[PDB]
Every structure is written in structure tokens, then in C-alpha cells.
Amino acid sequence: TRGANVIWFRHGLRLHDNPALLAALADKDQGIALIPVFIFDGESAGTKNVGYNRMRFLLDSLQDIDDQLQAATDGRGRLLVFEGEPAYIFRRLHEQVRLHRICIEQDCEPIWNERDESIRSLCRELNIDFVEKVSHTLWDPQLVIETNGGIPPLTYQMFLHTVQIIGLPPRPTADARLEDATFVELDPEFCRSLKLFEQLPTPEHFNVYGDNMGFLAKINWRGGETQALLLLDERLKVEQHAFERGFYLPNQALPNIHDSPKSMSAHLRFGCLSVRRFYWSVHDLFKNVQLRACVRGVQMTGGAHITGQLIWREYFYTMSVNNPNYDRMEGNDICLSIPWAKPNENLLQSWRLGQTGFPLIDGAMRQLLAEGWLHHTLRNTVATFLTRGGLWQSWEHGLQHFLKYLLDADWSVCAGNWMWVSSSAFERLLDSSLVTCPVALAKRLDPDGTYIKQYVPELMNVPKEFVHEPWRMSAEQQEQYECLIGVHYPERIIDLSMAVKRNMLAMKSLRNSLITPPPHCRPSNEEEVRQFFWLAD
């Protein structure tokens, strides 16, 4: 009629703290309608290399957006979901109703520049206003890069030093008022021609089915903005009591791998939860009060033990902005070139399928397949095991496996964590036994083997004395407990003692040749490594 404005969802699947959505609603007074649009283009929202679990999470998030639009407009507003190329869909959508502007939340990762540029050039041709808003991150990552002298900060301490100069991140924007917004009804033949979804599809519609084994799902995850704001309320409620109490309880600070999907990592990846609303609700809770207690070596004053977790996310996102080779070693200026072993498919497949013979490694990789989420310490041990603390394979193989099955699986965050853990050759402590030994770690995180028997069911009838080291059982014990090593449960795919030694020498031989390291993504110091891996020291 009078025209319409497009709020194009890729990430930022939420209605709160959406600067692009407010800009799309900025013309309600002129009769300009609103068109919520999501496009399955085969890459957006991490849909090029995706498994069933994350695809289910994304569809849960899209259904939440559509339901909120209906709830606030008495069923007048809908989320239009297409399938195809955006420039093809948007030009013909412009032919039906005159588009005045297309608003998006900035996808700062370089893997999105090609897609966003095709729409940018399409907006110049059709005289469509192209509105881009920085919102998926705490700061504009360029602002951090220009402050650091044109290069992104390569250490977590240098990133903190930069954002201290910049100041606190912006506050979340107001909530969108959709009750008075106008929406369009498209011609059914146009919805016919451009493959607009009548109902929200299932992952099977994109030929995505059960994982590499299937049904070990003990816990499940609900995507969407509504579930994200519920998990945040429960988190702040736990922090409110700890803030009033003045300290964490001893078990609240313990790594709990037997817990539940209370994590909000996937919700922050897809933008179901605003990172700024997260940051400032934690800030307002701890505001103007001096505490003394620490959480895993990090102070509690000002909620720094939580807001700092949102800094790690910002610190890996910023590093990749102007680096299109961020997910590989060859050609990456911020990654240490390490002589990894050439790809060994048998070792890689045994690591993906959780068939390494090491119980904690196998249980973590099978949980990744079943549920798509691992605790930060479980991601630590399986990353070290694949790389410097075991198989000596390239971190690129694990990055590609994580990006398919993780519920979060940010392109920059996952790649940065893989380089941070695997390619920091000058971090002496990283190669210690407190990190590379999954047996000693399994006895700390899972003393009774309950987590191991949950995801490695062949070790169910194995007693606690042998559940962490089943190869220690005698022949009579292996046959009594119905678990023969090499039949029911495979043998260790590698001799860990000789492998860790071999790999430690390769790191020492690597440092002595460079003598002085080139600037690369690395821990800031040894205290940061203790905090990163949850070391009891």
C-alpha cells in the first residue's frame, strides 16, 4: 500500500534490544507496514554445516518470533519464512510491495560480507534504504580494532585494556511496540513462486536427520527468545542470592557436568538473548557494592566473574572481523603455524564417534552428538586430546566437527577457542598433566562414573574402581562385567604417555626455532590458563 520496511532476521532472533527492529518500526506513523522475514539461504544462522540439534534450536527460535508477533498484534503479524536466495527474494518482494528500507543486525564475521554485500548493491539499485545496526556484540568490533592500532587484541588482557579505554558497552534499547504496527498480506501466487513456508518446516525438510548414533539424549533444549529470558531470570535469581549472601557456595563454583540446559550460550549465538541486556542486568545487580569473595579466582565485585564471560565472547568475535582465514591455519596471520600430523581419518572418525577408548573423551563426544552441548571443561579435554595433548591432529578437524553439532557454534568463538587451546606453544602450563590427562580429570568431574555410564552405556556394568580405567580390569573381570576391551569397548587408540611426550618435545622444538614469537592468539599469562581450564590450583 503505502510501502513496507523489512526486518530481516539472520541472527538476533528476538524482539527485545533490537535496534534494527525499532528502525523498521520507525515509520509506523506514516502507514509503513512491517514485514518480518527469515530466509533459509543455505548458510545464514549457521545452516551450511549444521546438524539436527542446532537446526531444531533454530526452528524453535523462529517459532518463538512468530508466536510473539501474533500475540502482540491479535494474529495480524506473522514471520514470513522463505527458502532461496535473499537478493532474488527481496527484489521480487519489492515488486509486490514497495520496500522503503531493509533493516538487519550486523553480522560482523567476514563469512557474511558476501551475502550482505549482494543486498547492499541491491538496495543501491532499487533505491532501498539499507539499515545496519551493531547489536550482536557488546561493542562495535571495529571500534575496538581502531583503538588497538588497526589490529584486534590478540590476548584477553589486551582486549580488556582496550575496552577500558573505550568505556562500558551501550545499554539495551527499548522494547518494540508492535500493537499498532501494520502488516501486509501477499498475493498467494507470489508466496507460491518465492517458496514462502506455509508452516514452519522440520529439519527433515532440509534433509537433516539423527546424528552419528542417535538417541542418547538425556536432556533437551528449547530455543527461542522466551526460553532465553527465562534462563536469564533464573540466573539472575541465583546471583541475587549469592549477591545478598556475599559469596558463592562451594558447590556453586564446582564444575557440574551432571546438570541441565541452564546455559545461554546457544541463545546468545542466535541472538535469542541480547548480550547487552545480559551484561547490564548483571551490572545493575552488583552495582555500587564492594564484595570480597572470588569465583574461580575472579572477583565478584561488579559481577566481573560473569561479565568477563561476555568479554571472552567479544574477544574472539573481534579478532576475526577482518580475517577471512580465521578458521584455518594456512594463511592466518594470528595463528601459530604448528606442524600438525597430516589428517588421519581413522583417528579422526574414532574421535568424532566417541570411540577413542578413553572414557571421559568418549562420553563427551557422544554427548556432543546426542545433545549438542558440552561443559567448558569437557570441551577443553577433548580439544587438547585431539591436538597437542594426544593425537597431534590439526585443530581444523575439531573446529569443523564442533561447528556441525554444537548448539551454539559461533564461527569466530569456536575457531578462536580452538586456536587458543591448541596452538599456544609458548604457554608452558598448557602441556602439563593437569590438562592433558583425561583420566585424572574424569576422576575429578565424575568420581562415580555416573556421567560416563550415562553416555558410554557399554561401561554401565563396570564398577567404580574400573569405570575410569577399564583397561585395568583382568580377563576374569572383563568377562564378568560384560565388557571386553577390543569388543564391547574399544582399546585406547593411542599410547597417551608416549604421545604427550612426543608432542611436548614438538612444542619445545618449536619455541626454540622461532626464539621470539610472532603476534598470535594466546593466553595473556599463566593465571589466565588456570581460570580457563578450571584448574584447582
Ligand SMILES: Cc1cc2nc3c(=O)[nH]c(=O)nc-3n(C[C@H](O)[C@H](O)[C@H](O)COP(=O)(O)OP(=O)(O)OC[C@H]3O[C@@H](n4cnc5c(N)ncnc54)[C@H](O)[C@@H]3O)c2cc1C
Ligand atoms: C574448544 C572450545 C570450543 C568452544 N566453542 C564455543 C562456541 O561455539 N560457542 C560458544 O558460545 N562458546 C564456545 N566455547 C566457550 C565455552 O565452551 C562456552 O561458552 C561455555 O561452555 C558455555 O556455557 P555457559 O554459558 O555455562 O558458560 P558461562 O560461564 O555461563 O559463560 C557465559 C557466556 O559467556 C560466553 N563465554 C563463556 N566462556 C567463553 C569463552 N571461553 N569464549 C567465548 N565465549 C565464552 C558464553 O557464550 C556464555 O553464554 C568453546 C570453548 C572451547 C574450549
